[PDB]
From a paper:
Prokaryotic cells and the chloroplasts of plant cells possess the ribosome-associated chaperone trigger factor, which binds nascent polypeptides at their exit stage from the ribosomal tunnel. The structure of bacterial trigger factor has been well characterized and it has a dragon-shaped conformation, with flexible domains responsible for ribosome binding, peptidyl-prolyl cis–trans isomerization (PPIase) activity and substrate protein binding. In eukaryotic cells, trigger factors are only found in the chloroplasts of plants. Chloroplast trigger factors (hereafter referred to as TIG1s) display a remarkable sequence variance compared with prokaryotic TFs, while the typical organization of the three domains remains conserved.
Residue numbers in the entry: 140 to 466
Amino acid sequence: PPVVWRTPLEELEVTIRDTGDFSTDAAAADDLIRQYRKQHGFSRVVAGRGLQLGDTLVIDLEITSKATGQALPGLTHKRFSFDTEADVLGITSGMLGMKAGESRTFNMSMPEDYDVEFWQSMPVKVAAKVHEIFEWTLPEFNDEYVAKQHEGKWGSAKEMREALIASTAMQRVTELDKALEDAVVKAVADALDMPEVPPRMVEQLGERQFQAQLLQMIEDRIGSREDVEKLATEEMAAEFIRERKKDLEDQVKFNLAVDDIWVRKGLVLEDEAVEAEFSLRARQMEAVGQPFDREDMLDDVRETVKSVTVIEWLKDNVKRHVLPYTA
């Protein structure tokens, strides 16, 4: 129960990289402008050539777990429309050169930033059949295009570019705030003498995270409730916990460390904050029609609210070093 601070909490520092600069935002705005224009683009069936970056297409898609052969819900479709240049999946690289009629099975890691948290970095097999391929010429980007096609939003080509640059730069700011939370959490985890993290505590947290992400899937309607509950297998749950063992141990060290700091810095739980987090958790559990132990939820709601309060504290009294972006 007593925590051993190898490196003191007073001499504790995080370091994070800025994740872009002006020329990165401008590039990204230019790519958003291209996607707006492609909604007003001219299309033609491609012939005597295979799929290239820039094309759009219609495909049969089937994406399955490598470990379990389970189909990822949301990602089986007979006539999926798809732009190579707005590719949330990363399936483009593995499809270049395909032609109408051709099929392909190929291995891939799901993206690390995928919206559906369950599937981040998961090794996956993609089966794809291409029904048809389309290429595009875009209208020129000038004030006339802006006035004809996005009127009332922007009064100029310049206005639109500036708007989209600001929005991309505002997104780096909130991504960076998140990397700070993660760095501050990895800081405390790393600044502890604990050669072995209590191992039921890693499994228990693995299991809670597993459930929280299955629930996020049902409430965000990213696949049928019956399909999502078909991935709630022991095999899937094993695979999830193992492929995050390091992340889960760091997270337990932090939770134990959070229990130390709470006494040391004399922090006080506000009952209104615990009841706000509990009711939020209880709504979720109702909408998905599932029972829970009130007391066990309460230990978990209390763990989460403390964690939120110690992260806020660390954020405003830990030594920040922000490194800058480089090519």
